[PDB]
């Protein structure tokens, strides 16, 4: 639950164009979920300057007064980039052999259109069709 806010903050700092996908936060009350005030603040800053880059966003956090905040904004950016690199990795792992599966599939289809397929081969084609979900 604490990482939810941190992930949101982090992702938005990494890509401020995501402010675009935040529904309205005005009627919420800040006082109820730690970090929400910060999120709201960034979202507002993002809406007030569309097209922002990460660096341009981080300009609003110069000065001594903002240092503890600038800090967490950068930490959280990194924690988030890792979380999604992790997720890309796990997702790529799952599709590792796709190039190889998707040509046994071509081979089975071609076999099927000229000679046809045995019972086992029909089942394998079916399995490949599930696995290549598009």
UniProtKB/Swiss-Prot annotation:
Cystine bridges: none
Coiled-coil regions listed: none
Subunit structure: Monomer. Interacts with DnaB. The primase-helicase complex is composed of up to three DnaG bound to one DnaB hexamer. Component of the replication restart primosome, which is composed of PriA, PriB, PriC, DnaB, DnaC, DnaG and DnaT.
Described purpose of this protein according to its UniProt entry: RNA polymerase that catalyzes the synthesis of short RNA molecules used as primers for DNA polymerase during DNA replication.
UniProt note: domains: Contains an N-terminal zinc-binding domain, a central core domain that contains the primase activity, and a C-terminal DnaB-binding domain.
Family designation: Belongs to the DnaG primase family.
This protein's name: DNA primase
Organism annotation: Escherichia coli (strain K12)
Upper lineage: Bacteria, Pseudomonadati, Pseudomonadota, Gammaproteobacteria, Enterobacterales
Residue range from the parent sequence: 447 to 580 of 581
């Amino acid at each position: 639950k604490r990482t939810t806010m941190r992930i949101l903050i982090g992702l938005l700092v990494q890509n401020p164009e995501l402010a675009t996908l935040v529904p309205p936060l005005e009627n919420l009350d800040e006082n109820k979920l730690p970090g929400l005030g910060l999120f709201r603040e960034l979202v507002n800053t993002c809406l007030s300057q569309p097209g922002l880059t990460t660096g341009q966003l981080l300009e609003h956090y110069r000065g001594t007064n903002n240092a503890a905040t600038l800090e967490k904004l950068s930490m959280w950016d990194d924690i988030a980039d890792k979380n999604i690199a992790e997720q890309t990795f796990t997702d790529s792992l799952n599709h590792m052999f796709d190039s190889l599966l998707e040509l046994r599939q071509e081979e089975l289809i071609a076999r099927e259109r000229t000679h046809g397929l045995s019972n086992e081969e029909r089942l394998e084609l079916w399995t490949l069709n599930q696995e290549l979900a598009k």
